[PDB]
């Protein structure tokens, strides 16, 4: 759609066969006549090496759409590759919650033995003192 040298919409696009990029024929031709090189990569290129854009041959194409079978298959990659990252958000957050639950239930199991002894000791002090 654009020419990489000028930045205009090229009215005669010709693609080079050393640095794959669509140049405008009239612009690239002058670049070759200046010095036999490709403007981007600075690799050697002649005018015969450059090739105009063409209809493929005899197989008829249709424009790139959502229906087209290959475009539909690359779509289903996007679906699954995104959903695979959705699983990491829940696998990583699960490893924090279960790690905080493990330390929480351990502090609960370490503390409730001290609640059981104070309920013993404060009642034993009331059982001892009241009898005297």
């Amino acid at each position: 759609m654009f020419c990489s040298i000028s930045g205009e919409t090229p009215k005669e696009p010709v693609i080079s066969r050393v640095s794959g990029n669509v140049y405008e024929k009239r612009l690239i031709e002058q670049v070759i006549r200046e010095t036999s090189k490709d403007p981007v990569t600075q690799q050697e290129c002649t005018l015969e090496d450059l090739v105009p854009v063409k209809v493929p041959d005899f197989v008829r194409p249709r424009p790139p759409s959502a229906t087209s079978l290959p475009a539909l298959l690359s779509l289903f990659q996007e679906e699954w590759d995104s959903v695979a990252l959705e699983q990491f958000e829940l696998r990583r957050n699960l490893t924090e919650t279960k790690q905080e639950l493990s330390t929480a239930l351990y502090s609960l199991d370490a503390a409730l033995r001290v609640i059981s002894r104070l309920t013993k000791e404060r009642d034993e002090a009331r059982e001892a003192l009241a009898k005297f």
Binding site: F58, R60, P63, K98, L101, S102, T103, Y106, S107
Partner: protein
């Protein structure tokens, strides 16, 4: 009051993790709540979808026609190409 304490917490966490994976595998009363949760979603989401669709459609059915009537031009620009 609270190496050996670190391993006993890691083993108990794996036991509760196995009990959580066992309570989930059995399910897949309770079924009526999930269906109603979806009826809220179906309502909320599809109303948003219909709003998103009709907003898009109004802008994009025109651009579809624009894009689709242009596609039919390739089918005639090709058919004449071969005869020539």
């Amino acid at each position: 009051x609270x190496x050996x304490x670190x391993x006993x917490x890691x083993x108990x966490x794996x036991x509760x993790x196995x009990x959580x994976x066992x309570x989930x595998x059995x399910x897949x009363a309770a079924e009526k709540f999930y269906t109603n949760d979806i009826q809220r979603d179906l309502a909320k989401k599809a109303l948003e979808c219909n709003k998103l669709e009709n907003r898009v459609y109004d802008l994009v059915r025109s651009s579809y026609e624009q894009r689709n009537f242009l596609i039919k031009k390739i089918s005639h620009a090709w058919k004449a190409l071969q005869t020539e």
